[model samples]
Structures are given as C-alpha cells and as structure tokens.
Target: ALQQLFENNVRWAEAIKQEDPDFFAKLARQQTPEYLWIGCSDARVPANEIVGMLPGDLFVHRNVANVVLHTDLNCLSVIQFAVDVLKVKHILVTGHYGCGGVRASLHNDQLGLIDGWLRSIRDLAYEYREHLEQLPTEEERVDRLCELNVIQQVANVSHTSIVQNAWHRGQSLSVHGCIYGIKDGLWKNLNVTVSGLDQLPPQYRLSPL
Candidate 1:
C-alpha cells in the first residue's frame, strides 16, 4: 500500500510537470493562497481535492469534527497566521454528513480521550434536542447536526480576536460554513457567510482599536 502511494505521488508529480514544467519551482518560491480551510479530519473530505485546488492554493487545518473552540490554541494559531500573515480572504469551516464524531455525540458512547472533545457537540445536541428529536430517524438528526456544527464553528471563527481585529483594520476577510457529502463526493454550502463586522451579531463585534 505504501509503495503504491509512493508510485502514485511520482506519477502525479510527473503529470504536473508535464502540464507545467515550472510548477514545482513556482510552488517552492512562495505559497500565497486566498482560502484558509478549517475542515474535519475525515479521509473522504480531503480539502484541496474536494475544492479542485492544488497544494499551494489552500492553507488547511483539520480536526476531528472541525470544532473551533475558544480554548483550542492549535486552531487559533492557524487562524492567526492565515489572517495576520497570509491575509487569506476566506476561511471555510467544513464538516460532513455521516460524520462519526457527530454520530458519537448524538449517542452516549463513552469513547476515551476523544470523549472530552465530543462533549462540545453533545452540548449543542442537547440545546437543539427538541428540534433533533423531531427527526424521523437518528441518521437524519446526525446529518442535520453536522451542518449545524459547521455553522457554529463558522460563528466561533468569526468571533475570534484574529478575525475581529482584521475587520477593525479593514482587511477583506470572510468565514464560511459548509458540509461535504460522503456518498456523492460533493460539497454543499450551509448558507452562513460572515464577511466582516457588519455580519456579526452586535454582542460579538469588537470596536475599532
């Protein structure tokens, strides 16, 4: 399997070189991508591949459920660099239907270390219990919660100091929520896009420095 992966990489590189002889050299000189992808760590949802982008076209950060918690320094650090340094124009928070993490949160399974992280989703599920319970099946509920999770994470990203400060300085940046369909290998925008201070709830907006 590893050998096949290596062979595939070699062929992919050759194919790229065939298309453009200087592709690798140009990629090495600099990486100036406009989109910062904050996505789930699902193998089915490879960020660049899903978007039909090359390696340098997307700056990516992945987590179990694409959760963006205020306390998650790892996620915040990526956001800071993408906003302040790379000046990425868009940050996409993408989850997926049929996510194991979302399903786990819907159920009461006591998975060890990951259980701590799943707590966040469980709380969200509880908050929307009335709505979720109305669904005809658990599958439908989990699928819908996956979209809700992406929406909430997009809100969390927009509320961060990095994003708020960028808006204060008039940087053109946006945070988007999206979902991927595993069965179809298609992406669906969840219709939540926060572009700047004007889009945030009043309570979450920061005054100019």
Candidate 2:
C-alpha cells in the first residue's frame, strides 16, 4: 500500500509539475487560506484535490467524521485561529457519504483504540435516531447520518463565544454545512446555516439577555 501510494504520488507530482514547475515553491511561500474545513481524516478525501481548490483556498483540521465538539480543544484552537486570526470568511463542515467514521458509528464493533472517537458520532446518531431510522436502506441511513453529523458540527461551531463576539463587534462571519458524495464530485448543502437564535440547537438556550 505504501509503495502504491509512493508511485501514485510520483505520478500526481509529475502531473502537477507539468502544469507548473514552480508549484511547490509558489505554495511554500505563505498561505492565505480563506476557508476552514472540518472534515474526516479519510485518505481518499483531501480538501484541495476533491474540492478542486488551490493550496491557499482552505485551512483544514480533520478527525473522524468531520466532527466539531466544543470540548475538543484541538478542534477549538483551529476554529480560533481560522476565525479570530486568519479571519476566514467561510467555515465548512464537510462529511463524505461513505465515511468510515459514520460506518463505525452505526456498527457495534469496538475499534480498539478509536472507540472514544467513534462514540461522538454514535452519540450524534442516537440524538437524531428517529429521523435517521426513517430512511429506507442502509445507504440511505448512512447518507442521512453523514448529513446530520455535518449539521451538528455547525451547531457546535456556533456554541463557541468567539462567533457571538464576532457578531457583537459587527464582524461578518458565516458558517455552513456540506456533504460530499463519493460517487459524484459534488458537494451538497445540508441546510445547517446558523445566523441567529431562531435556528439554534436543542440544548442551546440564548442567555446573557
């Protein structure tokens, strides 16, 4: 597998080099990435390649299922940097339709080391079990959960005070959720755009009034 990756990377690199001999040099300078991506760490899905975007187009942090947990300091710091420092205009939580994370969340097997990680998605599924169960087949179920996971992460982002503070200072910050179809090269909206309290999550209660 490693050898296959090496050969594939060589071919990919040559193709890139053919386009521009200075590809690496130009990208190495500094990044002005305008988007922050919360995505799965699945090797098949890379932010720039699948999205057909450039090097400086996105700032990304990936784990299982593109999760966003307020308690996960790792995810939080990336959010802080992207929003507060880099001031990215878009925050995208991208989950692919055939994600392994979503699969494990649906299954009963303990993945040994990543049990805790998968549980987060498991919890999300349980929260929206009613809606997910309504889907007809396994494929339908996976697709729905993947979309819902993206929505939940979008809510998690809004849970942070940083976004609220940005609003307070009249900053134009926005968050959006999307799901990628592995079969097709298109990103579909999950309709999880949060601008204010009216669309707030269930556990969320607007306070400091």
Candidate 3:
C-alpha cells in the first residue's frame, strides 16, 4: 500500500521539477510563507490544496478540532516562530463543518488522552449552550460549534504573548477565523479578524515598552 505512496511522490516530484527545474533547490534553501494555517488534522481538509497554495506558500500547524490552548507549548512555539522568525503576515485558525472531533466533544466518551484535548470544545459548548440549543438539528449545532470553535481559537491565538509582542513591535500581522464546508467544499470567513492591539479589549492589550 505504501509502495504506491512512494511512487506517487516520485511522480509528483518529477512533475514539479518538470514545471520548474530549480523548484526543489529553492524550496530546500528557504520557506518564506506569508500565512500560518492552524487547521484540523482531518485528511479531507488539505490546507494548501484547499487554498490552491504550493508547498512553500504556507506554514501549517494541525491538531484535532484546531484548538489553540494557552498551555500548549507546541502550538505556542509554532506561533512564536511564525511571528518572530518567519514573520508571517496572517494566521488562519480554520475548522470544518461536521468535524469528527467537534462532534465527539458533544458526547461523554472516555477516549483516554484525547479527552483532555477536547475539553476546550466541551467548555465552549457549555459557554454557548443557550445559542447552541436554539439550533434545530444536531448537524447544525455541530457545524455552528465548529464555527464558534474557530472564532474562539482565533481569539486564543491573538491573546498569545507572541502575537501581542509582534503587535507591540508594529508587525503587520492579522489573525482570522475561518471554516470549511465539507459538503460544498467552500470556505467561510467567520468575520472574526483581529489585526492589532486596538481591536482587542483593553485588558488583553499589552503596554508598549
């Protein structure tokens, strides 16, 4: 089965080389992507392919449900590197409608270590229970929660010290909340874009040095 994957890679690489002879060489030298995509680990949602971006066009970090936790150093490290080092202009926290992880968070299943990871979604559901309960169907509820999760994660990313420090230094960085429709294969902007310190509440805004 994996043998076919190796063959596929060979063909893909050859095609890329055929298109641009130095493509691989340049790719090896550096990756100066303008966007950092924080998306779900679902195979159906391929970040670069969905946006029509090439390999070097995006810096990506993926997790189940695309949750961004303050205590998650793995995600924080990626943000810091992308903001301070790569100097990416945009951070996209993307989720998808009918997400398995988001759906799973609705149930009380003892799924071991992953339960801890999905707690954020459960808390989000609790916070928005009034609104979520208003929805007619289970699918609609899950999809709405998916969008809400993206918005919350965007806020979480914006609240990070890495992004705040970058804003303090006058970096032109923006964090956006987005969701993908698996049914339609279309992306929807949740209208939760935070660009600068002024956009956030005064409490979350850091004082400039």
> Relative to the unseen true structure, what is the C-alpha lDDT of residue 97 in candidate 1, on a scale of 0 to 100?
96
Q: After superposition, how far is residue 162 of candidate 3 from its true place, in Å?
A: 0.6
Q: Which stretches of candidate 2 lie over 4 Å from their true place?
A: 1-30, 196-209
How does model 1 score by TM-score? 0.96
Q: For residues 142-166, what per-residue lDDT tens digits would candidate 3 score against the true structure?
A: 9989999999999999888889989
Residue-level lDDT tens digits of model 1 in 11-68? 9999999999999998899879999999889888999889899879999999998999
Q: In model 3, which regions exceed 4 Å deviation?
A: none
* Model 2, C-alpha of 200: deviation from truth (Å): 3.8
**Where is model 3 poorest over a 10-residue stretch in terms of lDDT?**
200-209
Between candidates 1 and 2, the TM-score winner = 1
TM-score for each model: 0.96, 0.82, 0.97
After superposition of all CA atoms, the RMSD between model 2 and the true structure is: 3.3
Clashes of 3: 0
TM-score-superior candidate, 2 or 3:
3
